């Protein structure tokens, strides 16, 4: 996250680290054994850790617990990025209290101007990089999607929005990817790709989660 | 592009 500030030991209880040796993507807790994350944070090996605010230290709350399997949406596509979404399963049921939660689907999308929170364990420096111990905030603003269909000419897709500054200092960057877009307690995006970071008139892309609530309930109920 | 590390 560039231009963030430190959240708070676990203000954010939804928040996931994917972990395979090293921290590589975020993720949202939506029941205590499904994770939300985005379609190309996929590999094997992948540890799922809970409760976390400092990534390198074990200080009280967290939960390590093993994916039992990863389901990439079928129609991923590596190249557009479109339906980058994915959902894992925990090997074993995680312990919901109040440093960990579940975070609501949203029944209905959210609209241009609504104010929303991203967090993740990602790059803060736009030019350069400097991986954070503790896990970052910024409160961004959905686009309308007139400016973000301007900012990407022939990249956004209907299962994308853009949120952040088109002034730029404050995106999510590498390492954010598969976090959470929060607004108004519903997770309406996941991080997803960009152009750079907090770079001017290029904001974030994040996958529409409003447009997989239907595939989610019925690939979970499935599973 | 995505921003993962570092796709
Ligand atoms: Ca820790």
Not at chain 1, 12 to 34: A, E, K
Request: aromatic content about 8%; some cysteine.
């Amino acid at each position: 996250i560039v231009g963030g500030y430190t959240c708070g030991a676990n203000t954010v209880p939804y928040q996931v680290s994917l972990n395979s040796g090293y921290h590589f993507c975020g993720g949202s807790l939506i029941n205590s054994q499904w994770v939300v994350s985005a379609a190309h944070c996929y590999k094997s090996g992948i540890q799922v850790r809970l409760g976390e605010d400092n990534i390198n230290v074990v200080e009280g709350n967290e939960q390590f617990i093993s994916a039992s399997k990863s389901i990439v949406h079928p129609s991923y596509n590596s190249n557009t990025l479109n339906n980058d979404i994915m959902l894992i399963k925990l090997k074993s049921a995680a312990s919901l209290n109040s440093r960990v939660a579940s975070i609501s689907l949203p029944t209905s999308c959210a609209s241009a101007g609504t104010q929303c929170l991203i967090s993740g364990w990602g790059n803060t420096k736009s030019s350069g990089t400097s991986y954070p111990d503790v896990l970052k905030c910024l409160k961004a603003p959905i686009l309308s999607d007139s400016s973000c269909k301007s900012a990407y000419p022939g990249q956004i897709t209907s299962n994308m929005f853009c949120a952040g500054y088109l002034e730029g200092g404050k995106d999510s960057c590498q390492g954010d990817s598969g976090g959470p877009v929060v607004c108004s307690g519903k997770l309406q995006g996941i991080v997803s790709w960009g152009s750079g970071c907090a770079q001017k008139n290029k904001p974030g892309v994040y996958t529409k989660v409003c447009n997989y609530v239907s595939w989610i309930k019925q690939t979970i109920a499935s599973n | 592009x995505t921003r993962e590390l570092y796709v």
